[model samples]
Target chain A: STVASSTTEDLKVSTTAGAAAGTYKINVTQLAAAQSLATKTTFATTKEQLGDTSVTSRTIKIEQPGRKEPLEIKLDKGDTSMEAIRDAINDADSGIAASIVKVKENEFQLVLTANSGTDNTMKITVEGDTKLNDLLAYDSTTNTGNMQELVKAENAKLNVNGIDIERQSNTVTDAPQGITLTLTKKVTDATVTVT
Target chain B: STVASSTTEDLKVSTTAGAAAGTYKINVTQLAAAQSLATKTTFATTKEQLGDTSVTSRTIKIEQPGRKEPLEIKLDKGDTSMEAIRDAINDADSGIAASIVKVKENEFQLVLTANSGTDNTMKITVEGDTKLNDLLAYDSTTNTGNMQELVKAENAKLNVNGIDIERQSNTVTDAPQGITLTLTKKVTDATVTVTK
Candidate 1:
């Protein structure tokens, strides 16, 4: 028994014993994507302070997709630089990832990444720092934030054997009972033959 | 040999062979929830015409979370009443469900429901009729709409064995590798023990 496909570039199919011997047609309309946000406020350098100089300390709360409690990152007044904050977030080992991007000389921005899928959309809040709050506070539900959405979170959408299917991830295991379909790209019609 | 739990009121646990025998402590902060929206504009009755009479027809598009394309519902000029629209949506068999509720005497509102999880949020669009568009257009991402959110879409959130977990559905199977935990309610601490 073997499984063959018409378009291996966009779709991959694997079968188990439970998979019936038949031809299955699939169409991928969309691919799952992670949510990404870039700060609207830019800095001269990574070491530039992110918040008001007067503030001694503040807490930034990240409301992530799966966890109920927000991941809080506290920063002291002296260590409020973009580089410092980025390192602090990375040290926490939270699902949310942070990075600093350099657009041009003397122009830098902070970008935050959340897990892919709509369930992983993010809500960021800042405490006791108006400058930081203005720079990073965001709410995906309302689409309000000082940050700009570089990429929107999305779920994978495809049609299989005449039935529409939607999943939070690109690697779908249950579409055709025992067939695992991995959607790499979007295509109109892809055929899979199980024999 | 058997699995025992301290609180069955909020959490239900089932084990497979892969489940290791051990004591597991759990806490549920939130349960998965479906997204629901209600019409901000109320009609005098279910049969009351919803949009401007001058407009002959319109197309309403519902953009669901998982599907790439939007579900389009076409309405004729004569079938613009709330009752007619409600029936049309139900007949479409889309993931989104619709209902008409009576708020008070001569006051009725239309409610729409989407699947649970943030990924299943809804965005509504209308074409060709301003009156109808104003009555039905909504975008959940931007939170701008004539429709009011009755319930916000949310994912199930809980802590298991000192690790926080989030799932789109209430029934989770992958956390402990072999245990199926169903979160029914929220709680501070619940304990489960698997002894062979």
Candidate 2:
């Protein structure tokens, strides 16, 4: 039996633009689990400078116990597409991989897949002023082997076992697996079934 | 009476190891709270270099809203001394300045002072794997002036109305005055008193 445990990790992201330049801090709390997995997690913390247009690259890190060390995987600017950021993260042998599937122009969804399944669970804590909405996407249901979209372009939806769930922001915390739906418009459902 | 609301601000630190190198993440979840001032809070986080000593000078970023963009700081490997790391962060102008005060041979403390009274109460969050213990420090007792020690080093003494308190690992989330302290050794009789 896959014992499902709902875990919530708190993250705080802050941005400071001083007279000199821009500095960003992303803090993740309750990293004990991530460290236990000995796997790496990735998220976006800043905007990348792309020629003519800039895109944000998801920030990634590895947490290992007794290692006394941490690693950073920076996504380069000029590659605003989520696919680019995902590729950059996977290129490193940091024990993690990411992918971005563009749902539409200037709109994309980010999927972070662990290199190894033993430590399949990933907890992310985000804090900052930068625009993170464009960096991550989530769908509660599993449809056609694809993670469903919780919300995209302001439109959100959720379907649980044929029951229509409420729509909320793309940010879905501690969601269960195997819910599916396509968001054609804004959703208002916020209730879901557990068990 | 100083009627000040307990203000909470988020602090972040990001770093990139080298060229074409992936950026690592370190999350500071807590800040240290001021012992005397009910109106103040602080927190901090620390990172260490496990390997790759050749990767000197990781680019550090500090983030806070309504203040400024992320400030980039550098961590150099050549300057393995705590003083060097403290100076590099202080010079970054992240609204805080740090100094290295040597207490014993090969034993030093990174003293971090706020740039202004306005930034007195701030939350610090760090990203990346580089050693960041020298970024911030705190004082649990008003009588004691300095509380600067390595991230995992030194035990913070907390006395409220002369009551003993526990010391824990310092991080940006539970900063001691907006800075966090990781307690290596436990203290039993630390005391502090509230004054009206």
Candidate 3:
């Protein structure tokens, strides 16, 4: 009997500071062979294959322009607790304040508050599976006899050029182009130049 | 004296409904001169020789996701009265209600009040660029105005899976592999269940 096998390999890394901010390219090489040779056989791939390969390389670019020393947080599987995630972010020298808000049993919300009046200071990076389980696996997954699910979500409200803009799920692949928010009110009142 | 001119072009489009709700691709092409071409003298000659036959095409694809329909308002621009963009939003089909509180001279603060208990239904989309200008534009720059700018400027607070997360923007490009946000809050909670 001819049998085939499938496997999924993932590489997860946590960086405090290393790569520059830009689009990084990741090349994936697939090495597989079937027991029997057929006339023509191509990988029955989905669009996700292309999408995944395209966004493979990780880049830590700031979504907002003209802002230096932006806050960045990177989480790894080893540090799966809420405190670990917060500490990783704090260690990045992102200059943003971090706090934990307890939502329910075995679940705590990690909030990153920016000290600057502008909202672009806070940025987060999640490598590895990024699954809810992977995010808060250290914490208990039950509360008061009821099973709890650990879901991680983040968003930001940017004041770009005076208008209030809201964005949910901030990740490397989804960061906005140019300055994320414009300080419209402040800009109008005074010509406060940002270099 | 002879001077060569550089070719440049710019394209712009404003649509009420064309490729709305889905990603669209755009392409451009440019042609090269045969197999070989010398300097400018031969380049021009070859281009003219080829004429319409010798042309190049370049392709560029652009994805324009559906912009949230803004609060629509039909107001006479001639009227010297102040109208809140939020009032227009509350009037729209959006399940959200809003109020405009006057903050300063010629400036009003817009507050969005969710009509329903669920936050998902509280979402609002603004349409009509010119109308948006009237509502949110404070200056001559068309792009530089209103709630669009405000929302785009900062991230929002979203609670997902009991996790309070802060996102820099609202647009979720890559959703989970199989997980999806089911708008079941409007429906019976019994309709949705975890089947592991």
Give the Å shift of residue B22 in candidate 1: 73
True contacts preserved, each candidate?
0.00, 0.00, 0.10
After TM-score superposition, what is the CA distance of residue B80 in candidate 1 from its true location, in Å? 46
Give the clashing pairs for model 1. Answer: B1-B195, B1-B196
**DockQ of every predicted complex:** 0.01, 0.01, 0.05
Task: Encode model 1's per-residue lDDT on A61-129: one tens digit a residue.
Answer: 988666788899999887689998899988998888999999999999999998788888889998999
Q: RMSD of each candidate?
A: 21.8, 25.1, 29.5
Q: Give the TM-score of candidate 3.
A: 0.20
Please, what is the TM-score per model? 0.47, 0.21, 0.20
Lowest summed-lDDT stretch of 10 residues in model 2 chain B?
B34-43
Better of 1 and 2 by lDDT: 1
Q: At residue A106, what lDDT does model 2 achieve?
A: 52
| Candidate 1 lDDT by residue in tens digits, B86-181 | 767866766665655443346667767665678878898888878878888889989999988866788989898889999877787788877888
Query: Higher DockQ: candidate 1 or 3?
Result: 3
Regions of model 3 farther than 4 Å from truth: A1-66, A69-75, A119-123, A132-195, B1-196
| Candidate 1 off by > 4 Å | A1-6, A16-20, B1-196
Error (Å) of candidate 1 at residue B66 is 38
Q: How far is candidate 3 from the true structure (C-alpha RMSD, Å)?
A: 29.5
